[PDB]
Amino acid sequence: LRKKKWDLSELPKFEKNFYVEHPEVARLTPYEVDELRRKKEITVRGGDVCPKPVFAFHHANFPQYVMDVLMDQHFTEPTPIQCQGFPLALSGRDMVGIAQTGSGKTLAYLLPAIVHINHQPYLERGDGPICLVLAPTRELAQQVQQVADDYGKCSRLKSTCIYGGAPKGPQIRDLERGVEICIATPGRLIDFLESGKTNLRRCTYLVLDEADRMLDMGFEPQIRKIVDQIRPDRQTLMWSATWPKEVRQLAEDFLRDYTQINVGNLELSANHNILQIVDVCMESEKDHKLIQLMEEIMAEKENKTIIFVETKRRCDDLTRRMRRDGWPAMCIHGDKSQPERDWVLNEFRSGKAPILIATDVASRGLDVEDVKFVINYDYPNSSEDYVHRIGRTARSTNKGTAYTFFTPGNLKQARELIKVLEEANQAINPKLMQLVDH
RNA sequence: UUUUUUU
Ligand SMILES: Nc1ncnc2c1ncn2[C@@H]1O[C@H](COP(=O)(O)OP(=O)(O)O)[C@@H](O)[C@H]1O
Ligand code: BEF
Ligand SMILES: [Mg+2]
Ligand SMILES: [Mg+2]
Ligand SMILES: [Mg+2]
Ligand SMILES: [Mg+2]
Ligand SMILES: [Mg+2]
Ligand SMILES: [Mg+2]
């Protein structure tokens, strides 16, 4: 029932180009700019329009309450993706930002969202959000909403999370009383738009987080329905650690004259702070191998572990076998009630439960303090998924370890895996090589 | 049963 709106732009009006270089940035010579990017491994796709990178938080002219939250976090320097992404976002250009897992992409798009909103007329009664952020999972949308909440406690900005499995009442109430920032999964937002609980008439700033996942074949049509409701002169910002060829052309259906920035290797790459370990075994030894791994992991104080499996059924079965065998393990997947999913992820965040067993519902975006191990019990569907899964550890500056159970049935992915491992200068299991050569 | 994504 949702039809592509054709906006008549001749009526409304809104503010776009408000970024002004800080004096420490204005005085940067081209040499100094190239050295900044080179040192931070920032690449601006050749021929694109792009401001200079900043190298300090005060360069972005965030409001003071934002800075106070940054100082409460004791964040001392913006990450590479923030150094180049803050100014580009704040300048108003459509963009694609590609940077390794745990590199701070969330703030890279949330804080310019706040400045953006601050240069707009205030919301009136009945107005929809100015900034819309779209994410592939309910937990990820809730996490991003809590970030936006920490940086808006001392301002007039309100945000809300719009996602399924949760009661509609409080979400509808948030929407009708008015929020500047809306974080959403696609289904529940489509539902609310069709029934008129919210609308996208004031939406001028649109973020696709985990953008390559949102453009895959199951999400693309939902993304298209939502984005057909947004004025075509909106600013569009796509973010991910992975940007495979197959999505690139498609992304341009939702972008105008955009700029792409990459941090790190232009090819597919994991975060280099993860120790990557690959075990070649048969399917049938996976159970035994896991137990031995866990017995090692659980002999140390810092033991927080995510275990990834391919299906909801194996998620349940492995979890039950671990807990009957007796381990302190809990699971999260798409057939759990949303109350159970929230309870399990909160227990895992807070250190009450050291072992999470998950499907790919937990593979993207989740930022959980002190995850020290990631275990691919089942190899994932793609190299990209591999990179995101193991990026659940070694966030920000921390280190972490990834163990992968690789079987002859995974053989057609071995090559691509080897390429990720070599790109991260890892010691390659000779058994993996020898499996490929035969 | 890939996995997610409004009852
Ligand atoms: N400038 C910074 N300095 C230190 N830590 C930061 C900075 N920006 C963000 N972080 C922290 O890094 C962690 C991962 O950031 P996040 O946006 O989730 O990464 P990504 O989206 O790039 O995977 C978060 O806990 C976040 O608070
Ligand atoms: F890329 Be981060 F892990 F969302
Ligand atoms: Mg400081
Ligand atoms: Mg954050
Ligand atoms: Mg401002
Ligand atoms: Mg086998
Ligand atoms: Mg993220
Ligand atoms: Mg759905």
Short mmCIF file of C-alpha atoms (C1' of nucleotides) and ligand atoms in Angstrom, two decimals:
data_model
loop_
_atom_site.label_atom_id
_atom_site.label_comp_id
_atom_site.label_asym_id
_atom_site.label_seq_id
_atom_site.Cartn_x
_atom_site.Cartn_y
_atom_site.Cartn_z
CA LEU A 1 0.00 0.00 0.00
CA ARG A 2 3.07 2.28 0.16
CA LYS A 3 3.56 4.04 -3.20
CA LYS A 4 6.61 5.97 -4.40
CA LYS A 5 5.93 9.62 -3.54
CA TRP A 6 6.82 12.20 -6.20
CA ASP A 7 7.85 15.15 -4.15
CA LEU A 8 7.19 18.62 -5.48
CA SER A 9 10.36 20.33 -4.28
CA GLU A 10 9.06 23.79 -5.33
CA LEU A 11 7.26 24.15 -1.95
CA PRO A 12 9.60 23.16 0.99
CA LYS A 13 13.12 24.45 1.83
CA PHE A 14 15.97 23.42 4.15
CA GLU A 15 19.62 24.04 5.05
CA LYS A 16 22.52 22.08 3.52
CA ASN A 17 25.96 23.74 3.34
CA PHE A 18 26.81 24.99 6.85
CA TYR A 19 30.21 23.39 7.47
CA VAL A 20 33.02 25.89 8.05
CA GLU A 21 36.63 24.78 8.36
CA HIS A 22 38.22 25.20 11.75
CA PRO A 23 41.34 27.45 11.62
CA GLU A 24 43.65 24.54 12.41
CA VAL A 25 42.15 22.76 9.39
CA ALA A 26 42.03 25.79 7.08
CA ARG A 27 45.76 26.34 7.54
CA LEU A 28 46.62 22.75 6.53
CA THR A 29 48.75 22.76 3.38
CA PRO A 30 48.04 20.18 0.65
CA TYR A 31 51.22 18.39 1.70
CA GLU A 32 49.96 18.19 5.29
CA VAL A 33 46.57 16.94 4.05
CA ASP A 34 48.15 14.16 1.99
CA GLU A 35 50.32 13.23 4.98
CA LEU A 36 47.30 13.13 7.30
CA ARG A 37 45.40 10.80 4.94
CA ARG A 38 48.49 8.64 4.25
CA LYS A 39 49.18 8.23 7.97
CA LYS A 40 45.53 7.37 8.66
CA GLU A 41 45.19 5.15 5.53
CA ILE A 42 42.30 7.27 4.24
CA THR A 43 41.51 7.07 0.52
CA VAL A 44 39.16 9.47 -1.24
CA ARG A 45 37.97 7.88 -4.48
CA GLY A 46 39.71 9.78 -7.28
CA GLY A 47 37.72 12.62 -8.80
CA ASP A 48 35.28 13.02 -5.90
CA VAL A 49 34.65 16.31 -4.12
CA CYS A 50 35.80 16.07 -0.50
CA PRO A 51 36.77 18.51 2.30
CA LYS A 52 39.97 18.15 4.22
CA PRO A 53 40.01 15.67 7.09
CA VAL A 54 39.94 17.02 10.62
CA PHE A 55 42.39 15.64 13.19
CA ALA A 56 40.67 16.69 16.44
CA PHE A 57 37.14 16.63 17.85
CA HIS A 58 36.89 20.43 18.31
CA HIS A 59 37.47 20.80 14.55
CA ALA A 60 33.89 19.70 13.84
CA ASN A 61 32.13 22.51 15.79
CA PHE A 62 29.94 20.01 17.61
CA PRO A 63 27.77 21.62 20.30
CA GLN A 64 29.28 21.67 23.75
CA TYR A 65 27.03 18.92 25.19
CA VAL A 66 28.33 16.55 22.47
CA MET A 67 31.92 17.38 23.51
CA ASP A 68 30.97 16.76 27.15
CA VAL A 69 29.79 13.27 26.28
CA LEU A 70 33.00 12.64 24.28
CA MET A 71 35.04 13.69 27.33
CA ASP A 72 32.90 11.50 29.63
CA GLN A 73 33.84 8.64 27.28
CA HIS A 74 37.49 9.82 27.48
CA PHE A 75 37.73 9.69 23.68
CA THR A 76 40.88 11.64 22.89
CA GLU A 77 41.17 11.60 19.09
CA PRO A 78 38.73 10.85 16.28
CA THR A 79 39.30 7.61 14.37
CA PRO A 80 40.38 7.72 10.70
CA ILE A 81 36.83 7.23 9.44
CA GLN A 82 35.71 10.00 11.80
CA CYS A 83 38.57 12.32 10.72
CA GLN A 84 37.49 12.13 7.08
CA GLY A 85 33.78 11.29 7.58
CA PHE A 86 32.86 14.13 10.03
CA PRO A 87 33.67 16.90 7.54
CA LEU A 88 32.28 15.12 4.49
CA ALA A 89 29.00 14.38 6.25
CA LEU A 90 28.82 17.89 7.73
CA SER A 91 29.41 19.40 4.29
CA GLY A 92 26.17 17.79 3.12
CA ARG A 93 27.38 15.49 0.35
CA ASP A 94 25.98 12.03 -0.21
CA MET A 95 28.64 9.54 0.81
CA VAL A 96 29.79 5.97 1.19
CA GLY A 97 32.13 5.24 4.10
CA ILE A 98 34.05 1.97 4.31
CA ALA A 99 36.16 1.24 7.38
CA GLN A 100 37.15 -1.75 9.48
CA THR A 101 34.92 -3.17 12.20
CA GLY A 102 34.94 -1.33 15.54
CA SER A 103 36.38 1.87 13.96
CA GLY A 104 33.64 4.20 15.17
CA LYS A 105 31.39 4.43 12.14
CA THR A 106 28.38 5.02 14.41
CA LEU A 107 29.62 8.38 15.72
CA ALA A 108 30.91 9.22 12.25
CA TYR A 109 27.30 9.41 11.15
CA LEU A 110 25.41 10.27 14.37
CA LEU A 111 27.25 13.43 15.37
CA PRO A 112 26.91 15.18 11.99
CA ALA A 113 23.27 14.09 12.17
CA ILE A 114 22.99 16.19 15.35
CA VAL A 115 24.67 19.24 13.81
CA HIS A 116 22.49 18.81 10.71
CA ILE A 117 19.34 18.77 12.85
CA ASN A 118 20.57 21.82 14.75
CA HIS A 119 20.59 23.86 11.53
CA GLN A 120 16.92 22.99 10.75
CA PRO A 121 13.72 24.59 12.01
CA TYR A 122 12.52 22.87 15.16
CA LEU A 123 9.98 20.12 14.81
CA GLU A 124 6.38 21.14 15.00
CA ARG A 125 3.57 18.95 16.30
CA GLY A 126 2.97 16.02 13.96
CA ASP A 127 6.34 16.35 12.23
CA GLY A 128 8.30 13.19 11.43
CA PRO A 129 12.03 12.66 11.98
CA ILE A 130 14.71 14.77 10.35
CA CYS A 131 17.30 11.95 10.53
CA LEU A 132 16.51 8.31 9.70
CA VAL A 133 19.00 5.50 10.36
CA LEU A 134 18.24 2.04 8.92
CA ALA A 135 19.85 -1.12 10.32
CA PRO A 136 19.49 -4.86 9.55
CA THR A 137 18.72 -6.18 13.04
CA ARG A 138 16.61 -5.17 16.02
CA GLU A 139 19.53 -5.41 18.44
CA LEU A 140 21.69 -3.23 16.22
CA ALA A 141 18.96 -0.57 15.93
CA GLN A 142 18.53 -0.54 19.69
CA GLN A 143 22.28 -0.15 20.17
CA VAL A 144 22.50 2.80 17.76
CA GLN A 145 19.51 4.39 19.47
CA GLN A 146 21.22 4.14 22.88
CA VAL A 147 24.29 5.85 21.40
CA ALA A 148 22.12 8.69 20.12
CA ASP A 149 20.50 8.85 23.54
CA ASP A 150 23.84 9.36 25.36
CA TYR A 151 24.65 12.41 23.17
CA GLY A 152 21.20 14.02 23.49
CA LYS A 153 20.36 13.83 27.16
CA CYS A 154 21.26 17.55 27.54
CA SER A 155 19.58 18.91 24.39
CA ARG A 156 16.13 19.26 22.91
CA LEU A 157 16.76 16.32 20.55
CA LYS A 158 14.65 13.19 21.01
CA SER A 159 15.32 9.85 19.37
CA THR A 160 13.44 6.57 19.17
CA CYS A 161 13.90 3.00 18.05
CA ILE A 162 11.36 1.50 15.64
CA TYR A 163 11.63 -2.27 15.34
CA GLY A 164 9.48 -5.41 15.41
CA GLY A 165 8.72 -7.91 18.15
CA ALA A 166 8.24 -5.07 20.62
CA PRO A 167 4.91 -3.48 21.63
CA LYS A 168 3.71 -0.81 19.21
CA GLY A 169 2.29 1.46 21.91
CA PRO A 170 5.42 3.15 23.30
CA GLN A 171 7.01 3.40 19.83
CA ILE A 172 3.86 5.08 18.44
CA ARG A 173 3.81 7.42 21.40
CA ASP A 174 7.44 8.42 20.80
CA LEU A 175 6.68 9.08 17.13
CA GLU A 176 3.55 11.17 17.74
CA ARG A 177 5.12 13.29 20.44
CA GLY A 178 7.98 13.95 18.01
CA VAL A 179 11.55 12.74 17.51
CA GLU A 180 14.32 14.30 15.49
CA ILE A 181 16.22 10.99 15.20
CA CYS A 182 14.59 7.71 14.22
CA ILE A 183 16.58 4.46 14.26
CA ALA A 184 14.65 1.64 12.61
CA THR A 185 14.53 -1.86 11.23
CA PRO A 186 12.66 -1.82 7.88
CA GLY A 187 9.59 -3.95 8.63
CA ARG A 188 8.11 -2.08 11.60
CA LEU A 189 8.87 1.27 9.96
CA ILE A 190 7.04 0.26 6.77
CA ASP A 191 4.18 -0.87 9.00
CA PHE A 192 4.02 2.51 10.80
CA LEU A 193 4.28 4.48 7.53
CA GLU A 194 1.41 2.58 5.90
CA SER A 195 -0.86 3.26 8.90
CA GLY A 196 0.22 6.90 9.31
CA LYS A 197 1.92 6.72 12.73
CA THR A 198 4.91 8.65 11.33
CA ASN A 199 6.04 10.14 8.03
CA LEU A 200 9.22 11.06 6.16
CA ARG A 201 8.29 14.55 4.99
CA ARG A 202 10.97 16.25 7.12
CA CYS A 203 13.57 13.53 6.54
CA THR A 204 16.63 15.23 5.10
CA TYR A 205 19.41 13.01 6.50
CA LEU A 206 19.32 9.25 5.75
CA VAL A 207 21.85 6.69 7.02
CA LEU A 208 22.07 3.11 5.77
CA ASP A 209 24.19 1.39 8.36
CA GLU A 210 25.62 -1.97 7.30
CA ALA A 211 24.74 -0.64 3.88
CA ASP A 212 25.83 -3.68 1.84
CA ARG A 213 23.52 -5.90 3.94
CA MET A 214 20.63 -3.47 3.46
CA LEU A 215 21.13 -3.70 -0.30
CA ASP A 216 21.06 -7.48 -0.54
CA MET A 217 18.13 -9.17 -2.24
CA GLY A 218 15.93 -9.50 0.88
CA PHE A 219 16.41 -5.98 2.21
CA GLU A 220 16.70 -3.95 -1.02
CA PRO A 221 12.90 -3.96 -1.71
CA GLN A 222 12.07 -2.90 1.85
CA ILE A 223 14.78 -0.22 1.68
CA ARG A 224 13.30 0.91 -1.66
CA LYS A 225 9.78 1.22 -0.24
CA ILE A 226 11.00 3.36 2.68
CA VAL A 227 13.30 5.55 0.55
CA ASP A 228 10.56 6.13 -2.05
CA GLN A 229 8.89 8.15 0.73
CA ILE A 230 11.81 10.57 1.21
CA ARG A 231 12.43 13.78 -0.74
CA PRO A 232 15.01 13.19 -3.49
CA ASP A 233 17.20 16.11 -2.37
CA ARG A 234 17.89 14.35 0.96
CA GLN A 235 21.45 13.61 2.01
CA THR A 236 22.26 9.88 1.88
CA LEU A 237 25.13 8.25 3.82
CA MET A 238 26.04 4.56 3.56
CA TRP A 239 28.43 2.84 5.97
CA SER A 240 30.05 -0.56 6.22
CA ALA A 241 33.21 -2.48 6.87
CA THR A 242 32.64 -4.38 3.58
CA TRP A 243 31.73 -3.01 0.15
CA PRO A 244 31.62 -5.83 -2.42
CA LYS A 245 31.32 -5.19 -6.16
CA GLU A 246 27.82 -6.71 -6.29
CA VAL A 247 26.27 -3.85 -4.29
CA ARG A 248 28.07 -0.88 -5.82
CA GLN A 249 25.93 -0.11 -8.89
CA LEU A 250 22.78 -0.81 -6.86
CA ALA A 251 23.80 1.66 -4.15
CA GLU A 252 23.81 4.38 -6.79
CA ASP A 253 20.05 4.05 -7.18
CA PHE A 254 19.87 5.74 -3.76
CA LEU A 255 22.74 8.23 -4.14
CA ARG A 256 23.25 11.51 -6.00
CA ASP A 257 26.71 12.96 -6.71
CA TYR A 258 28.41 11.03 -3.93
CA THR A 259 31.88 10.65 -2.49
CA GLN A 260 33.38 7.37 -1.39
CA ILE A 261 36.01 7.14 1.29
CA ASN A 262 37.85 4.02 2.39
CA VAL A 263 40.13 3.44 5.34
CA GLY A 264 42.66 0.67 4.97
CA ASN A 265 43.03 -1.78 2.14
CA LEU A 266 40.67 -1.18 -0.76
CA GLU A 267 40.09 -4.93 -1.04
CA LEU A 268 38.19 -7.02 1.49
CA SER A 269 40.02 -6.92 4.80
CA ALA A 270 39.55 -7.91 8.42
CA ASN A 271 40.49 -5.74 11.40
CA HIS A 272 44.21 -6.39 11.87
CA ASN A 273 43.99 -6.61 15.68
CA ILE A 274 42.27 -10.05 15.49
CA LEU A 275 44.42 -13.12 15.87
CA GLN A 276 42.90 -15.37 13.15
CA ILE A 277 43.02 -19.15 13.76
CA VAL A 278 41.52 -21.70 11.31
CA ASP A 279 41.10 -25.39 12.20
CA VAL A 280 40.53 -27.87 9.38
CA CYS A 281 38.38 -30.71 10.70
CA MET A 282 35.38 -32.82 9.75
CA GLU A 283 31.82 -31.82 10.55
CA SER A 284 31.59 -34.68 13.02
CA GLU A 285 34.44 -33.44 15.24
CA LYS A 286 33.03 -29.90 15.61
CA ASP A 287 31.30 -30.71 18.92
CA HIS A 288 34.40 -32.24 20.44
CA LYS A 289 36.61 -29.48 19.11
CA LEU A 290 34.35 -26.81 20.61
CA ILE A 291 34.44 -28.39 24.04
CA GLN A 292 38.22 -28.47 24.05
CA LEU A 293 38.38 -24.83 22.88
CA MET A 294 35.95 -23.74 25.59
CA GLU A 295 37.90 -25.59 28.25
CA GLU A 296 40.91 -23.49 27.30
CA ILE A 297 38.97 -20.21 26.99
CA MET A 298 37.16 -20.64 30.32
CA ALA A 299 40.47 -21.21 32.12
CA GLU A 300 41.11 -17.44 31.82
CA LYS A 301 39.43 -14.47 33.48
CA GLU A 302 38.76 -12.63 30.21
CA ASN A 303 36.60 -15.27 28.60
CA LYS A 304 33.66 -13.54 26.86
CA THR A 305 32.91 -15.54 23.70
CA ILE A 306 30.48 -15.45 20.78
CA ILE A 307 29.94 -18.72 18.89
CA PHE A 308 28.35 -18.43 15.41
CA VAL A 309 26.37 -21.25 13.70
CA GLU A 310 24.55 -21.41 10.37
CA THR A 311 20.92 -22.09 11.35
CA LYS A 312 18.42 -21.38 14.11
CA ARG A 313 17.94 -25.14 14.63
CA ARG A 314 21.65 -25.78 15.12
CA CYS A 315 21.79 -22.68 17.33
CA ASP A 316 19.17 -24.26 19.62
CA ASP A 317 20.63 -27.76 19.48
CA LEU A 318 24.22 -26.71 20.12
CA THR A 319 23.07 -24.42 22.96
CA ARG A 320 21.08 -27.26 24.57
CA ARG A 321 23.95 -29.75 24.18
CA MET A 322 26.32 -27.24 25.78
CA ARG A 323 23.93 -26.54 28.68
CA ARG A 324 23.02 -30.18 29.25
CA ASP A 325 26.72 -30.86 29.08
CA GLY A 326 26.23 -27.90 31.34
CA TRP A 327 28.20 -24.87 30.13
CA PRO A 328 27.02 -21.31 31.05
CA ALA A 329 25.88 -20.67 27.48
CA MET A 330 22.83 -18.87 26.08
CA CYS A 331 21.58 -18.37 22.53
CA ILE A 332 20.08 -15.63 20.37
CA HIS A 333 18.35 -16.15 17.00
CA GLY A 334 15.29 -15.09 15.01
CA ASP A 335 12.84 -17.62 16.46
CA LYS A 336 13.38 -16.34 19.98
CA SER A 337 10.78 -13.99 21.38
CA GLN A 338 12.05 -10.40 21.37
CA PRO A 339 11.92 -10.35 25.21
CA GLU A 340 14.20 -13.40 25.25
CA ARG A 341 16.53 -11.86 22.65
CA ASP A 342 16.85 -8.63 24.65
CA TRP A 343 17.30 -10.50 27.93
CA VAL A 344 20.08 -12.68 26.48
CA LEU A 345 21.99 -9.81 24.85
CA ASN A 346 21.70 -7.69 28.03
CA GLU A 347 23.03 -10.59 30.12
CA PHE A 348 25.90 -10.93 27.64
CA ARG A 349 26.69 -7.19 27.60
CA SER A 350 26.75 -6.94 31.38
CA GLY A 351 29.11 -9.85 32.07
CA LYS A 352 26.55 -12.14 33.72
CA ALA A 353 26.82 -14.63 30.88
CA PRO A 354 30.16 -15.33 29.17
CA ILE A 355 29.00 -17.47 26.20
CA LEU A 356 26.61 -16.32 23.48
CA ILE A 357 25.61 -18.74 20.70
CA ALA A 358 24.14 -16.91 17.72
CA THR A 359 23.10 -17.03 14.09
CA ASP A 360 24.14 -14.17 11.80
CA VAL A 361 21.62 -12.01 13.72
CA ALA A 362 24.65 -11.09 15.89
CA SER A 363 27.18 -10.82 13.08
CA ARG A 364 26.94 -7.14 12.15
CA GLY A 365 27.32 -3.97 14.16
CA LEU A 366 26.89 -5.24 17.74
CA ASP A 367 29.38 -3.46 20.03
CA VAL A 368 29.69 -5.60 23.17
CA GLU A 369 32.29 -4.69 25.78
CA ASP A 370 35.15 -7.14 26.29
CA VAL A 371 34.30 -9.83 23.72
CA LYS A 372 37.62 -11.67 23.65
CA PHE A 373 36.79 -14.73 21.43
CA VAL A 374 34.71 -15.35 18.32
CA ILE A 375 34.24 -18.95 17.19
CA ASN A 376 32.86 -19.87 13.78
CA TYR A 377 31.43 -23.25 14.67
CA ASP A 378 30.02 -23.21 11.10
CA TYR A 379 31.84 -21.29 8.38
CA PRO A 380 29.61 -18.45 7.13
CA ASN A 381 27.99 -17.93 3.70
CA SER A 382 30.57 -15.41 2.48
CA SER A 383 33.96 -13.83 3.11
CA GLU A 384 32.18 -10.58 3.98
CA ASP A 385 30.12 -12.29 6.69
CA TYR A 386 33.36 -13.84 7.96
CA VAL A 387 34.94 -10.39 8.34
CA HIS A 388 31.92 -8.92 10.15
CA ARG A 389 31.56 -11.94 12.50
CA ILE A 390 35.14 -11.90 13.67
CA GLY A 391 34.87 -8.13 14.02
CA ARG A 392 32.62 -8.70 17.05
CA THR A 393 35.93 -8.76 18.99
CA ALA A 394 38.96 -6.47 18.84
CA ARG A 395 36.79 -3.37 18.80
CA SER A 396 38.28 0.12 19.02
CA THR A 397 41.93 -0.52 20.08
CA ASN A 398 41.40 -3.87 21.90
CA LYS A 399 42.72 -7.21 20.70
CA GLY A 400 40.78 -10.43 20.28
CA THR A 401 40.97 -13.90 18.85
CA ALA A 402 38.96 -15.70 16.17
CA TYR A 403 38.81 -19.49 15.83
CA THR A 404 37.22 -21.02 12.75
CA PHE A 405 36.16 -24.66 12.21
CA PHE A 406 36.72 -25.27 8.48
CA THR A 407 35.55 -28.49 6.78
CA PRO A 408 35.87 -30.10 3.32
CA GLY A 409 32.24 -29.02 2.73
CA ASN A 410 33.48 -25.40 3.01
CA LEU A 411 36.09 -25.99 0.29
CA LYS A 412 34.71 -23.61 -2.35
CA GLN A 413 35.25 -20.69 0.06
CA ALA A 414 38.83 -21.61 1.05
CA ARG A 415 40.50 -19.40 -1.57
CA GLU A 416 38.70 -16.26 -0.49
CA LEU A 417 39.41 -17.01 3.15
CA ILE A 418 43.11 -17.42 2.40
CA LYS A 419 43.07 -14.01 0.76
CA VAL A 420 41.61 -12.40 3.90
CA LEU A 421 44.15 -14.18 6.10
CA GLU A 422 47.11 -13.11 3.92
CA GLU A 423 45.83 -9.53 3.77
CA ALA A 424 46.00 -9.49 7.59
CA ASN A 425 49.53 -11.02 7.58
CA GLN A 426 48.28 -14.11 9.43
CA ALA A 427 50.09 -17.40 9.84
CA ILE A 428 48.17 -19.71 7.49
CA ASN A 429 47.33 -23.20 8.70
CA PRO A 430 49.32 -25.54 6.37
CA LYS A 431 46.38 -27.93 6.59
CA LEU A 432 44.18 -25.27 5.00
CA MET A 433 46.64 -24.83 2.09
CA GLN A 434 47.06 -28.59 1.64
CA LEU A 435 43.27 -29.03 1.65
CA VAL A 436 43.02 -26.53 -1.21
CA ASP A 437 45.88 -28.03 -3.24
CA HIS A 438 44.34 -31.54 -3.31
"C1'" U B 1 15.52 -25.28 7.61
"C1'" U B 2 20.55 -20.12 4.99
"C1'" U B 3 19.97 -15.64 7.79
"C1'" U B 4 17.63 -11.47 8.89
"C1'" U B 5 13.64 -8.06 8.16
"C1'" U B 6 5.98 -5.49 10.25
"C1'" U B 7 0.94 -9.78 13.10
N1 LIG C 1 37.26 8.49 18.68
C1 LIG C 1 37.09 7.35 19.38
N2 LIG C 1 38.05 6.97 20.24
C2 LIG C 1 37.92 5.83 20.95
N3 LIG C 1 36.85 4.99 20.88
C3 LIG C 1 35.80 5.27 20.07
C4 LIG C 1 35.87 6.49 19.25
N4 LIG C 1 34.72 6.52 18.54
C5 LIG C 1 33.99 5.42 18.88
N5 LIG C 1 34.64 4.66 19.79
C6 LIG C 1 34.14 3.38 20.38
O1 LIG C 1 34.49 2.28 19.53
C7 LIG C 1 33.52 1.23 19.64
C8 LIG C 1 33.08 0.71 18.28
O2 LIG C 1 32.51 1.79 17.53
P1 LIG C 1 31.37 1.51 16.44
O3 LIG C 1 30.73 2.75 15.81
O4 LIG C 1 30.42 0.49 17.01
O5 LIG C 1 32.32 0.78 15.33
P2 LIG C 1 31.91 0.29 13.85
O6 LIG C 1 30.59 0.77 13.58
O7 LIG C 1 32.85 1.06 13.03
O8 LIG C 1 31.95 -1.22 13.73
C9 LIG C 1 32.34 1.84 20.40
O9 LIG C 1 32.33 1.28 21.72
C10 LIG C 1 32.63 3.34 20.43
O10 LIG C 1 32.08 4.01 21.57
F1 BEF C 2 31.74 -2.28 11.43
BE1 BEF C 2 31.29 -2.17 12.91
F2 BEF C 2 31.58 -3.61 13.46
F3 BEF C 2 29.77 -2.01 12.74
MG MG C 3 41.34 14.46 26.31
MG MG C 4 29.44 4.70 19.65
MG MG C 5 25.28 22.30 16.07
MG MG C 6 33.51 -33.50 6.95
MG MG C 7 28.77 -0.34 13.16
MG MG C 8 9.54 -9.29 8.65
#
